[PDB]
Amino acid sequence: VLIKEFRVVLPCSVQEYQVGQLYSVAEASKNETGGGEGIEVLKNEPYENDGEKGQYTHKIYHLKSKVPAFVRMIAPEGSLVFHEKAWNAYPYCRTIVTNEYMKDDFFIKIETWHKPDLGTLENVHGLDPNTWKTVEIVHIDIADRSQVEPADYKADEDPALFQSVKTKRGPLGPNWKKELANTPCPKMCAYKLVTIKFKWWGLQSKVENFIQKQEKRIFTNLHRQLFCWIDKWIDLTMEDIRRMEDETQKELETMRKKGSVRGTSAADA
C-alpha cells in the first residue's frame, strides 16, 4: 500500500473550480478516447447517501495500449478495464478505482478536499497522526516546466505562457504562488490523498510506485490544461456542465469505436 498527498494550488476560487474541474475532466476524457481505448461513462447522477448530497459517477477506462508493456505481459487478455466510482460531494470527493480480475487485491482511492488557501493545511484528511507522518506530500506547480514529462509538453498548454482573456490572470511566472499569497484574486488548493494497493508478489512496490507516478502526471497535465482552458469554462453554470456531460457521455461512446488511439500513454520502456 502506498499513500501520497498531492497538493494542487490554483489561481481560481473553490467555487469556480467546481465548474472548471468538471469541464476539464470532460474534455480530457475525450482526448484519451478512440480506437477501442478511452473513457466510458456508465453513470453521472445526483445522490444522497445518509446525510450527504452529491454527484455520483461510474466510468470505465479501457487502457490496452496505454499501459506499459510489462503490464500487458502479466495481465490476462481483456482484463485491462478499470471501473472508477466517484462520490463528488464538492468541496469533498471520494473516488475509487477497481479492476474485476484483481478483485480485492487492487485499488486506487483518491480523496480530495478543496480549500480556499495555498496548500499549507496539514493532514486535512484527518488521518491517524502516525500514519500521516508516513505520507509523502507532493506539491504540484502547474507553472513549473520541470514537473512536466517532455513527451507531454505542449506550448499551447503551458500556463507559464498563457494569459486569460476573460479574467486577465496573466501567464504564471516562477513566483506566481507567493504573489497570489499577498494578492487578496481567487486562490485555492486541491488536497488529493491517493492510496494505492496492488498486491502481487514480486510487483507490489513496482506497480504501486508506477501508479502514483502516473497519478502525479495525470493531475499535472489536467490542471495545466484546466488553467489554459479557463476562458472556455469560467463563465459556465453548473447547468451548462450537466448539459455538456450528457453530450460528452454520448460522444465518448462513438469516439471509442472509431479512429485510432489518442492521448496520454505510459511506458516503462
Residues that bind ligand PCW (CB under 6 A): 22, 25, 28-29, 32, 57, 61, 63, 66-67, 71, 75, 79-80, 82, 84, 86, 88, 93, 95, 97, 99, 101-102, 108, 110, 112, 192, 207, 211, 214-215, 218-219, 222, 263-264, 266
Let me know: does 9 contact 226? Beta carbons within 8 Å.
no
Please return the burial class of 145, using the count of CB atoms within 10 Å of its CB with bins 0-12, 13-18 and 19+: middle
Largest CA distance in the chain: 54
Number of Cβ atoms within 10 Å of the Cβ of 79: 12
* Of 60 and 174, CB closest to ligand PCW: 60
| Shortest distance in whole angstroms from residue 55 CB to ligand PCW | 7
| Shortest distance in whole angstroms from residue 28 CB to ligand PCW | 4
| Shortest distance in whole angstroms from residue 259 CB to ligand PCW | 16
CA distance 243 to 208: 36
| Shortest distance in whole angstroms from residue 170 CB to ligand PCW | 26
* Of 45 and 184, CB closest to ligand PCW: 45
| Shortest distance in whole angstroms from residue 111 CB to ligand PCW | 8
Q: How many CA atoms lie within 13 A of 68 on its CB side?
A: 11
* Of 45 and 129, CB closest to ligand PCW: 45
Please return the burial class of 108, using the count of CB atoms within 10 Å of its CB with bins 0-12, 13-18 and 19+: buried
| Shortest distance in whole angstroms from residue 182 CB to ligand PCW | 29
* Of 5 and 215, CB closest to ligand PCW: 215
* Of 181 and 218, CB closest to ligand PCW: 218
Closest C-alpha among 5, 10, 1 to residue 229: 10
Task: Name every residue whose Cβ is closer than 8 Å to that of residue 65 and which is 6 or more positions away in sequence.
Answer: 37, 261, 265
* Of 43 and 258, CB closest to ligand PCW: 43
